[PDB]
Amino acid sequence: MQSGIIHAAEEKDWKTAYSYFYEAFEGYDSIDSPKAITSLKYMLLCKIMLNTPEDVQALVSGKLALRYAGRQTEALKCVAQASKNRSLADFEKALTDYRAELRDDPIISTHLAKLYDNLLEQNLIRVIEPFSRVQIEHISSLIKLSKADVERKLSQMIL
Amino acid sequence: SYSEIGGLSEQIRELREVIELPLTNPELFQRVGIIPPKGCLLYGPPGTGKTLLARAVASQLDCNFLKVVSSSIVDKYIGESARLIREMFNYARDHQPCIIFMDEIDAIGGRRFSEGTSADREIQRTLMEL
Amino acid sequence: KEQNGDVKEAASILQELQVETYGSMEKKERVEFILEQMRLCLAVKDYIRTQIISKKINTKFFQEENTEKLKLKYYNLMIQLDQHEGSYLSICKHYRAIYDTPCIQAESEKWQQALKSVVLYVILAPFDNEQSDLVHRISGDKKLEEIPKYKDLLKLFTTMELMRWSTLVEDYGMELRKGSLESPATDVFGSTEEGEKRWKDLKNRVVEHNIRIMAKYYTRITMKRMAQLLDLSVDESEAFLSNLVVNKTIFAKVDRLAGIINFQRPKDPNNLLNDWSQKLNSLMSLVNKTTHLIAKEEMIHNLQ
């Protein structure tokens, strides 16, 4: 578990970080439930860090996750589902009811700012894909944001 | 003769189950989840009646049955009686279901305890095949 | 039956179902018993379990040649579960199996509504290459054209073109009071939420169907022309084209600022465009050359 936390602050390797939490859960299984229920939050969140929400649903669909299903696993599934649907409004709507589970995140700034910087272009790929020539003022109404930082982020996308 | 031998009753019925029952009734086994036992062992003469009992099982159950004396695997040069165990098992996969006798399995079952000579080594080689 | 059962009592029989599946083989009575719990599972309100136990039923199929006719009447219970939540296409192929019960009938009203029930799901199902050849199997039947609404249904499919959507509602809005058969509209419009979802479904299907001809005929179009063509605001067209572009069924670039919108033409800058176009076109008269050759060769040998 600690190996996972330190690797999350290091951000160097996002792959083995999920491996450490997986093994840790294998240790906490069948003996102590309170540690096992809190161990899934980190593994699934680190899989969201890897921008692979499709595998999250597959992990929570197994027979092992059904016994440990609860209010937290739905908070993991809703972040996976908002990242798959690429909608920040659904993410924020679910962020208020699951904020009790969001506070357990040791660093709330890292994951949320990286996911916001990600979901930015995940909302842009929907508006950009249909047509090449686009005005900035009408397309900024969909994401609901000033045009300044938007153009800054788009130019960044070119870079 | 299967009635003539007298005892031993629980052994008689035991080999009747583990031998005959997987043939006729694989369902009973496949339901419970148990894999059928593929082998068995008999030993005398603490008493005797080995080749009798098992013999009347071969002539009793009938179906397909194969006779083996341990002295036919000698082969002299080139222990290809090993490849006769391979080919023999292939024809047991042809005429399957089949039953295999093994008489005097001590010699073709040896330990290779002390490293020695040639015979023991190639015998152990056919044993590796088995 | 004593306590009428609940979520727990219906779950007690669940774990007992599969105990006798591998224990013994029973032709009829067991099947009747194994479908008994799902009809209580609808009252349990839990669907994810109902689909598991319903997944045990399909491995028992094909059940025909025994009963004949009762188990064909159970499909009416299965379509209830499949039509409920997520799939309109799962009932498509299965309603042709519930159409085999009136085949033995000996019944008119049940059969007459079976035809409409099987014909009206084409709209509710998302378009696919399997749907295309699905509707061709039912088309041309001698019993099917008995329904006058079937000619409207077929008219929208054959060669597309265009039609006013309100005039479509003139034909399909009468079927609520019309009948004879009200059962298809009893499934659609019976639940207000169900009926509304299939209203937006019909809208999505007609606007998606108007698009695929526009995709073959463009070239280009003005944005404002598509609005008056689809009888809706330009904002609604933006929503529609967003879902169509994320479905990547047809590539397009639709510029809102300048009003010029178009589907395709594919870029194909140099290689494949000129390759296929120029060459195959040139080979037309080349491969047809020898064809008309023998035509004149036979004509001149008929008279000489």
Ligand SMILES: Nc1ncnc2c1ncn2[C@@H]1O[C@H](COP(=O)(O)OP(=O)(O)OP(=O)(O)O)[C@@H](O)[C@H]1O
């Ligand atoms: N329970 C028995 N019932 C009838 N006959 C028996 C019984 N046990 C031994 N015999 C007799 O023993 C003779 C040899 O058969 P058996 O298979 O016992 O030899 P064996 O066990 O290989 O002998 P050993 O073990 O001494 O080499 C047979 O003629 C048989 O009549």
